[PDB]
Amino acid sequence: SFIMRLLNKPVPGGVAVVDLGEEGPPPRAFYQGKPVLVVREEGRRWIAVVGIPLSTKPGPQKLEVRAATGNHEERFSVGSKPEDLKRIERELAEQTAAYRRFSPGLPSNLMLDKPVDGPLSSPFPHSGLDFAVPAGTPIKAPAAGKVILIGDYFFNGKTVFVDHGQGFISMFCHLSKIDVKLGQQVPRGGVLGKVGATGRATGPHMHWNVSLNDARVDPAIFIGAFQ
Ligand SMILES: [Zn+2]
Numbered sequence: 410s411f412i413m414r415l416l417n418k419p420v421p422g423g424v425a426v427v428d429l430g431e432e433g434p435p436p437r438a439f440y441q442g443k444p445v446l447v448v449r450e451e452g453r454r455w456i457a458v459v460g461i462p463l464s465t466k467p468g469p470q471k472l473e474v475r476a477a478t479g480n481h482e483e484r485f486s487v488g489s490k491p492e493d494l495k496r497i498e499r500e501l502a503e504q505t506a507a508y509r510r511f512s513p514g515l516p517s518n519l520m521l522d523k524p525v526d527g528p529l530s531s532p533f534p535h536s537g538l539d540f541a542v543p544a545g546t547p548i549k550a551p552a553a554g555k556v557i558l559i560g561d562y563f564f565n566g567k568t569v570f571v572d573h574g575q576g577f578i579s580m581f582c583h584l585s586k587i588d589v590k591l592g593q594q595v596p597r598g599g600v601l602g603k604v605g606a607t608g609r610a611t612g613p614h615m616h617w618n619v620s621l622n623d624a625r626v627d628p629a630i631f632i633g634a635f636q
Contacts, residue, residue, distance in 0.1 A: 420490035460621025514574035566608025
């Protein structure tokens with residue numbers, strides 16, 4: 410499928426699309442103990458869309474599949490490519506918990522829109538994708554989702570997490586303005602807020618993280634810009 414052609418980039422920091430050998434009731438899947446996004450491929454076979462951490466050594470990998478008719482493992486391959494620290498600890502803990510959220514819903518779209526209309530800057534260590542846009546540029550939801558975290562953090566500044574469903578999560582930080590509320594359900598294209606330089610940034614810094622199964626992956630894969 411087109412979504413297999415787009416998303417199957419199995420490298421460290423990348424994405425593996427794995428045939429689950431299931432077509433009936435929805436199976437559950439786990440990679441390194443973390444629950445993984447499971448969707449029908451254009452309404453047909455069940456596939457996992459698996460985030461591969463950047464620290465993953467190339468080689469064979471295992472996915473645990475759970476189904477009523479019996480559990481099984483499916484292998485795939487990764488190829489090569491100031492002031493109180495107590496606050497900081499708490500802020501790290503909140504963000505860590507947010508990426509580990511696994512809500513039951515299916516993502517509205519797996520191919521994501523660019524969150525800002527501007528050129529890409531820094532890759533994807535740098536755990537996301539930058540865009541060269543000025544402060545005040547509106548940031549739009551790459552897919553539909555629920556706002557599961559809003560913070561004003563020491564390092565990341567004004568930060569918003571959007572849960573697209575089943576661990577598929579966008580994060581945006583250093584915002585000047587956040588226009589959404591905690592728990593708010595936003596459509597694809599909904600305005601989340603405005604680009605800024607809050608937290609530890611040197612000038613306007615539009616930063617976008619994409620996570621799958623608690624693994625930060627290259628957002629360029631989802632917009633068709635891998636690389
Ligand atoms: Zn960045």
